[PDB]
């Protein structure tokens, strides 16, 4: 057999120019898109201010329009999903990740407008969903769209253009290219059988988008924790501990998200209007909390910097944790178009921080700075729920810039999966596919 | 479908027995990577309490500054030709092959051979890295336990082998993230799904990095300091630089390859026509390492100096070529030592120069050569060894200039994008193929 390999080696890294060139067109498109989405989202969360402030005198009139808006939109969201693209609803990565193994279609001529405008409402309203996930999906479709519009055929160019579309997407989302790759090839990628995804193809894609994103988002990051202190080897074990905690709570949060999404099915049975109505319901709810305690609502990003600094008191932390631990489930589990990738970071950050403060006072001789713990854990609730450590560790670094904490960040995320494993749980992203894959059949 | 649905629900489940072993492995690799690195220096040191002792009589210097690097270089080749022919050279082509099960892991041989062996080639002053050598010393370590504990099952043979490499690659550059991205972008059997447990590797990598930090704390291997940044209007410049690496990438490959043939004739396969040719190039190096060190040795030390802009356009090109030579002549000579590390130096040096040119070319981009000296520190990896992602990240891992990530990629990418469209192949795979085909028949 060694006769073949010897020929396969000498025939490596040869990816058709036609493919590479397309991954470029794709990567590019994804970017422009990821941008406009992100742009549109804000623009609305904005209007929802030139609303409140206009009626900032009559308190009940506020709390009122601070519900209606996030309700009218959230609904509009669910609608554009239940009536045009049931596949959109929820993250959207379980699908792309499945569509890779060829177990789900990529109805882009549907999903795109649906997921786009759709989440524009859910997110542009104030719900507890990220916009990253939604993009990963919006991305792949973009890849597909070209694949179809140029009918270049051949597995390679169907799994490749699909994968890069994702990566490009994930990247332009956090302005993090390295993550967008490590991701596709640690998670999305068909987990059990060699595949025709051209790594290099992805890169060009990722890049092309990050550039596109930098074209409209330069001079400002999404987070800016600033160089935190360092971490001595005698304080390493502390990050392991924090890791283990994430490890036990990782699968749990997974049960909830999962089951909770069932217990939320009863309320509407599958009825477009029992949903849309329940939609603007949680939606409006959020928009309200987003003007009575915003750290419980919205993306959650904005409170990461504040959290890492140590501006939240042990009290305000725990409160914010729980509150979100709830708004998050109730929003994602409700099949609304939006993801739980981003908001998971927030929880991570917040949980980590707290662990820090405890540590700080526990041993003042380690000269700790909660901020570091608020980082060893920013992506740990990713290394337990979504079990994609390597993608997290790197996504964090990618946008937190504290490589000095690489040793801790790993020892945590590792310890994370090391307990998210030894205690049930599974890739919250895989489980979703499986279910939505088994429910596909087992129903005929 | 039904299968998949059961496969998903059965993911990330790696036997506690495996994980626990990857740990013992990782650990061992570290302590090892350390003592190696420690010993190497110790020698490059003695070769000072030698020269200085005879720093009065010039020719007496240039003399003992050859004999030492000769006596050792030989001792190296010897412990290889007579005890482990598989060691000689990098050592990665093997491990990478041993993964697909096309080469054996004669650890009870390789370990002492490669170790003490390269301790001489390197500890003398040859143009070979110590990284590669360790990747190999690593896998074996992984093997050794596999055997000593006869835990059987592909998974625990491909896993403990892989992590052993990673752990090794890591403790080498104190770069964990690299040690992983590497195994799963290169070493990994390139064409068929495998039973290597990612998580298994991590625990391994970590365990070694910790082990390395235990004895190497408070000091990095490189310290370029936060360089400036890079505006989107100076991006294309890094593409250009990338394309240059992309054309010279395969070329340097031809040479390394062929040159290792043209170096075969001199000894035919004779243990003594080698050993003699060994301390020949060996002694040569040790000499240059006291008449122009930037042409000899690991080459690390001159990366910082290079990135700063301390070398003039003259001294750069000279240092490039000189090394472009000493490197081939040393690695291609099947001496136990790798070309991973020294390839960085070339990259850095080539990059820098490109910088200075740029700087004066357009002073309106307010460039700083230093950044180009980095978009390319690992670009001659993204062409020779065609492992961009592992490079990009190994650089960052120990350069700390994430602000340059956009450039660093656009180069390395542009690198393989030409190393491709112009012949060339994974200098690491080609070696295996050859050393695999030269096997059957």
């Amino acid at each position, epitope marked *: 057999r060694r006769r073949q390999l010897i020929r396969q080696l000498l025939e490596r890294d040869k990816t058709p120019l036609a493919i590479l060139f397309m991954a470029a067109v794709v990567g590019t498109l994804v970017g422009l898109a990821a941008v406009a989405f992100d742009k549109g989202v804000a623009w609305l969360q904005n209007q929802r201010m030139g609303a409140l402030v206009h009626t900032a005198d009559n308190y009940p009139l506020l709390l009122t329009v601070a519900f209606l808006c996030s309700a009218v939109l959230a609904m509009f969201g669910y609608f554009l999903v239940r009536k045009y693209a049931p596949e959109a609803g929820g993250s959207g990565i379980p699908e792309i990740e499945g569509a890779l193994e060829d177990q789900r279609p990529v109805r882009w001529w549907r999903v795109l407008p649906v997921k786009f405008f759709g989440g524009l409402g859910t997110l542009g309203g104030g719900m507890v969903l990220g916009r990253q996930g939604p993009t990963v999906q919006i991305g792949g479709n973009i890849g597909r769209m070209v694949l179809d519009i140029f009918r270049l055929k051949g597995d390679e160019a169907r799994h490749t253009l699909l994968a890069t579309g994702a990566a490009a997407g994930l990247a332009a989302a956090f302005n993090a290219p390295l993550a967008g790759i490590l991701f596709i090839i640690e998670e999305m990628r068909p987990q059990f059988r060699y595949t025709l995804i051209s790594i290099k193809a992805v890169f060009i894609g990722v890049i092309m988008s990050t550039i596109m994103y930098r074209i409209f988002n330069h001079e400002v990051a999404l987070i800016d924790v600033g160089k935190l202190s360092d971490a001595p080897l005698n304080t390493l074990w502390l990050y392991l501990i924090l890791g283990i905690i994430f490890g036990i709570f990782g699968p749990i949060f997974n049960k909830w998200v999962l089951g909770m999404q069932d217990l939320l099915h009863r309320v509407h049975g599958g009825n477009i209007t029992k949903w849309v109505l329940m939609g603007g319901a949680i939606g409006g709810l959020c928009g309200l909390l987003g003007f009575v305690a915003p750290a419980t609502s919205g993306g959650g990003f904005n409170l990461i910097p504040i959290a890492t600094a140590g501006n939240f008191s042990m009290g305000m932390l725990v409160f914010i944790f729980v509150a979100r631990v709830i708004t998050t489930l109730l929003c994602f589990s409700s099949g609304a178009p939006g993801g739980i990738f981003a908001p998971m970071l927030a929880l991570g950050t917040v949980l980590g921080t707290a662990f820090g403060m405890v540590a700080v006072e526990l041993f003042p001789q380690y000269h700790l700075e909660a901020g570091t713990f608020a980082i060893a854990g920013m992506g740990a609730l990713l290394a337990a729920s979504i079990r994609a450590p390597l993608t997290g560790i790197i996504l964090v670094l990618e946008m937190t810039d504290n490589y000095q904490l690489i040793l801790p960040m790993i020892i945590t995320g590792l310890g994370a999966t090391l307990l998210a494993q030894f205690t049930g749980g599974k890739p919250l992203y895989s489980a979703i596919l499986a279910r939505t894959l088994a429910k596909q059949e087992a129903e005929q | 479908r039904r299968q998949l649905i059961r496969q998903l629900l059965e993911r990330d489940k790696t036997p506690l027995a495996i994980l626990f072993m990857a740990a013992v492995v990782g650990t061992l690799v570290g302590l090892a990577a350390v003592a190696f690195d420690k010993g190497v220096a110790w020698l490059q040191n003695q070769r000072m309490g030698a020269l200085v002792h005879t720093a009065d009589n010039y020719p007496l210097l240039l003399t003992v500054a050859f004999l030492c690097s000769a006596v050792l270089a030989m001792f190296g080749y010897f412990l290889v030709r007579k005890y482990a022919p598989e060691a000689g050279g990098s050592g990665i082509p093997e491990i990478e092959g041993a993964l697909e099960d096309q080469r054996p892991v004669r650890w009870w041989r390789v370990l002492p051979v490669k170790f003490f062996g390269g301790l001489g080639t390197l500890g003398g002053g040859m143009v070979l890295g110590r990284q590669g050598p360790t990747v190999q010393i690593g896998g074996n370590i992984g093997r050794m336990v596999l055997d000593i504990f006869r835990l059987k099952g592909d998974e625990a043979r491909h896993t403990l082998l892989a992590t052993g490499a990673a752990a090794g690659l890591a403790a080498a550059f104190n770069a964990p993230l690299a040690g992983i991205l590497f195994i799963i972008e290169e070493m990994r059997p390139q064409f068929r799904y495998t039973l290597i447990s990612i998580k298994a590797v991590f625990i391994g990598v970590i365990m070694s990095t910790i082990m390395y930090r235990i004895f190497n704390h408070e000091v990095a291997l490189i310290d370029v300091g936060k360089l400036s940044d890079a505006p989107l209007n100076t991006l294309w410049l890094y593409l250009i630089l990338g394309i240059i690496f992309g054309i010279f990438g395969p070329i340097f490959n031809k040479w390394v390859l062929g040159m290792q043939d043209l170096l075969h004739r001199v000894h035919g396969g004779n243990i003594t026509k080698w050993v003699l040719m060994g301390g020949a190039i060996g002694g040569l190096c040790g000499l240059l390492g006291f008449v122009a060190p930037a042409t000899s040795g690991g080459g690390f030390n001159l990366i910082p100096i290079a990135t700063a802009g301390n070398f003039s356009m003259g001294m750069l090109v000279f240092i490039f070529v000189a090394r472009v030579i000493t490197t081939l002549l040393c690695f291609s000579s099947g001496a136990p030592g790798g070309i991973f590390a020294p390839m960085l130096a070339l990259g850095t040096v080539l990059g820098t120069a490109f910088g200075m040119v740029a700087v004066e070319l357009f002073p*309106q981009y307010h460039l700083e050569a230093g950044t180009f000296a980095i978009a390319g520190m690992g670009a001659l990896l993204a062409a020779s060894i065609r492992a961009p992602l592992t490079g990009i990240i190994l650089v960052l891992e120990m350069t700390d200039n994430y602000q340059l990530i956009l450039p660093m990629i656009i180069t390395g990418l542009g690198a393989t994008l030409l190393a491709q469209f112009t012949g060339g192949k994974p200098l690491y795979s080609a070696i295996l193929a050859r050393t695999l085909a030269k096997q059957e028949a």
Partner: antibody
Amino acid sequence: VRLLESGGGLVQPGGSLKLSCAASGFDYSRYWMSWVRQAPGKGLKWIGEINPVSSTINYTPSLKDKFIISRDNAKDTLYLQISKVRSEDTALYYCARLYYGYGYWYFDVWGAGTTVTVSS
Amino acid sequence: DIVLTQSPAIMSAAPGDKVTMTCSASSSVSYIHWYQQKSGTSPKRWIYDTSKLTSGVPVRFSGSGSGTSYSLTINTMEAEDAATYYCQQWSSHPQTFGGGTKLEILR
């Protein structure tokens, strides 16, 4: 972010004056500092620019050492030495902080000013 | 070195009016900048990269142009816009400023 430059004043033809510019409210390093002068009534004319590590320093088309820009990052201060001054050198001297958008650098935060009058 | 020459040397218009000032380059430039200088103050970075208002610039202001000729505009100018605007380029070393345009308000 305050850019306060002192030094200016009265100097007799063929003289020399060391204009100073103390920075505060930001990281002096990572920053390219420059000077630009405005002649009473007239417009602005770029003098020089000196990168962080001061490993680069350029000036407008003006001879040998009419100008000598330097900086002591240890004191976050920018300097400017004008020698053999002449009436054409009487103007308002500003020290700006340099940055860029897409990359075609701009004069970010201009300091106060300091005036140099050449006269006997 | 590039010779930027701002068209109206001096101009006056009554607030709420639409005013536009030009800035031509002898050769070719790209991503021009604009600085606003009110009496008694050092210049202030107004518009940049041809049309990126700076953090704080009223959305009243707008940048434009291309290669050989650029401009800066004020849709409905207000009285607090009285000042001297300076276009500057650095798309070709050494950088160069314009002759300036002095806006004056009619009341």
